[PDB]
Amino acid sequence: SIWNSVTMFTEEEEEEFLQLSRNPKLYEILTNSIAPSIFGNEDIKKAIVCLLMGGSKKILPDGMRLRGDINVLLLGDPGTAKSQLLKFVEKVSPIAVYTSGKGSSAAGLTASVQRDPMTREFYLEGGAMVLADGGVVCIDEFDKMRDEDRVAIHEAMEQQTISIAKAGITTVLNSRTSVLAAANPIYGRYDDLKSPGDNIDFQTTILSRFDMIFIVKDDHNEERDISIANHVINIHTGNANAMQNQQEENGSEISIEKMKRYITYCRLKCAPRLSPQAAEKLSSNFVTIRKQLLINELESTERSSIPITIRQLEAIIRITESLAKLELSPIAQERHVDEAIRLFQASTMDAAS
């Protein structure tokens, strides 16, 4: 039904939406429904939750405006089943486009303009970003891409507006997308035997333009391997884990078709905001982290591979409105930010070593 889908709805759905949102364990019951098949990797399992909500949108005078939502890489070894996770985000999200390219398949990835042979007339051809306006775009093989449609991708993650300057038309259009890339290293764990950069061919400013870099490892463990193997045999047949999923649905883990409508309703109704003591908390954390990069920077006699910028502070300040926009409340609280200190702090432990 997209584009021009249905917004307003009935009365009892408001009732049951106000009945789901009052549970104290909303974060757990959302972080157990995303991977009923993927074992392990609970951090990414947490990070998809704060990505499907979207941040705040501020149109403060002047003509400038800020953005939402955050952007996530998932670089790591094969066997992470990150591609199946991207198929899951394709199934959940209200609008979502899955392009594994290089452009795929007979459809390009950016906003190309093709003149109609009849009438000799310009029109917007399509692509990936323009069809998916107001949601999530998932990409495979972000390192192995053509590099002529790359400048537009490194523009549409920052100011949300793709520009066209061809021979006839000079319009500037909107794209409120939220990129979720997933690249692949060469030789695997030798990346973390090297410096944590040294994967993308050209430069590492790309790794500073993103927000939450995740790095997946693999360590052989016997009970872990028997657990994943016996788990996958339980996944196969005769879908006993799906029967168990039905007895989960009798108790918790609401639905897919309830989850989609819940994401739409929680997205376009509320608009959250913080409290200034949380702001002095976040200043009191970020200044100490930057000083720690100053002392680690001065002692280790070289420059760092993954820098820290104020975009990292802007990502930290958007995570709290993601989680408040889950909790449906207009204001923010202290533990309500400290959980994001734990999570982004786990991504800094992903970042440094």
Partner 1 sequence: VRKDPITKEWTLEGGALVLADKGVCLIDEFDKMNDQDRTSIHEAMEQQSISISKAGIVTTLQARCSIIAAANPNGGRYNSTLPLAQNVSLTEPILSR
Partner 2 sequence: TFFAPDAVFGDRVRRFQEFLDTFTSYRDSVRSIQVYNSNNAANYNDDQDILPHRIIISLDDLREFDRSFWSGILVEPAYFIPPAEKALTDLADSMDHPWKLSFKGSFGAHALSPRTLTAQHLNKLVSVEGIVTKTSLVRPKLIRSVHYAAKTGRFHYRDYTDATTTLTTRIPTPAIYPTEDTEGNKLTTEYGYSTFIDHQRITVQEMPEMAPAGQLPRSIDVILDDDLVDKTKPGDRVNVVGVFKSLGAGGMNQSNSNTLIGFKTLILGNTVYPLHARSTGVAARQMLTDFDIRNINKLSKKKDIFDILSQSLAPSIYGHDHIKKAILLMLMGGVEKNLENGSHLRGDINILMVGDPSTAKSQLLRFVLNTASLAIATTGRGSSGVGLTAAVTTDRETGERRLEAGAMVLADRGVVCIDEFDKMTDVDRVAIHEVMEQQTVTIAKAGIHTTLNARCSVIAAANPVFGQYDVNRDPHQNIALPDSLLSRFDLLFVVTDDINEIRDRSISEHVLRTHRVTIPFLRKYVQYAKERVIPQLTQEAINVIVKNYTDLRNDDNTKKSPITARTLETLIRLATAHAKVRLSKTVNKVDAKVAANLLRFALL
Q: Count CB neighbours of 307 within 10 A.
A: 14
> Is 276 one of the annotated binding-site residues?
no
Shortest reach from residue 281's CB to partner 2, in Å: 10
> Is 171 one of the annotated binding-site residues?
no
The 3-state secondary structure of 120-176 reads: CEEEEEECCCCCCCCCEEEEECCCCCCCCCHHHHCCCCCCCCCECCCCCCCCECCCC
Specify the stretch interacting with partner 1 by CB under 8 A; choose among 43-51, 62-70, 105-113, 309-317: 105-113
Instruction: Please name the residues in contact with 331: beta carbons below 8 A apart, sequence gap of 6 or more.
Output: 272, 273, 274, 275, 324
Size, binding site for partner 1 by CB under 8 A: 23
Bond into 82 cis (ω within 30): no
Shortest reach from residue 306's CB to partner 1, in Å: 26
> Is 163 one of the annotated binding-site residues?
no
> Taking Cα atoms as reference points, which of 282, 285, 269, 281 lies closest to residue 328?
269
Specify the stretch interacting with partner 1 by CB under 8 A; choose among 139-147, 202-210, 218-226, 310-318: 139-147
Cα 321 to chain centroid, rounded: 15
Among positions 71-110, residues that touch ligand ADP (CB under 6 A) are: 78-84
Give the residue with the Cβ less far from ligand ADP, 39 or 123: 39
> Is 79 one of the annotated binding-site residues?
yes
Shortest reach from residue 110's CB to partner 2, in Å: 10
How far apart (Å, rounded) are the C-alpha atoms in residues 353 and 350? Answer: 7
Specify the stretch interacting with ligand ADP by CB under 6 A; choose among 31-39, 112-120, 194-202, 237-245: 31-39
3 binds partner 2 (CB under 8 A): yes
8 Å CB contact between 142 and 182:
yes
Among positions 72-91, residues that touch partner 1 (CB under 8 A) are: 78, 83, 87
Among positions 30-59, residues that touch partner 2 (CB under 8 A) are: 56, 58
By a kind-dependent CB cut-off of 5 to 8 A, residue 239 interacts, out of ligand ADP, partner 1, partner 2, none, with none
> Is 194 one of the annotated binding-site residues?
no
> Taking Cα atoms as reference points, which of 158, 216, 173, 174 lies closest to residue 191?
216
116 binds partner 1 (CB under 8 A): yes
Shortest reach from residue 177's CB to partner 1, in Å: 16
Applying CB under 8 A, which of residues 274, 323, 337, 340 lies at the interface with partner 2? 274
How far apart (Å, rounded) are the C-alpha atoms in residues 85 and 169? Answer: 39
Tracing tokens 């100490």 back to the chain, one arrives at 288
3-class secondary-structure state, position 256 = coil
8 Å CB contact between 285 and 343:
no
Applying CB under 6 A, which of residues 37, 112, 204, 333 lies at the interface with ligand ADP? 37
Give the residue with the Cβ less far from ligand ADP, 142 or 262: 142
277 binds partner 2 (CB under 8 A): no
42 binds partner 1 (CB under 8 A): no
Phi then psi for residue 347, to 5 deg, are -75, -25
Q: Count CB neighbours of 9 within 10 A.
A: 12
8 Å CB contact between 18 and 328:
no
Give the residue with the Cβ less far from partner 2, 98 or 265: 98
Strand partners, 163: 172
Counting beta carbons within 10 angstroms of the beta carbon of residue 138, is it exposed (0 to 12), middle (13 to 18) or buried (19 or more)? buried
Q: Determine if residue 40 is left, alpha or beta; phi over 0 gives left, psi from -120 to 50 gives alpha, anything else beta.
A: left
> Is 62 one of the annotated binding-site residues?
no
Q: Which residues are annotated as a binding site?
A: 76-83
Interaction site with partner 1 (CB under 8 A): 78, 83, 87, 98, 100-108, 114, 116, 125-127, 131, 140-141, 144, 184
Q: Which residues are annotated as a binding site for ATP?
A: 76-83
Binding site for ligand ADP (CB under 6 A): 37-40, 78-84, 158, 228, 232, 310-311, 314
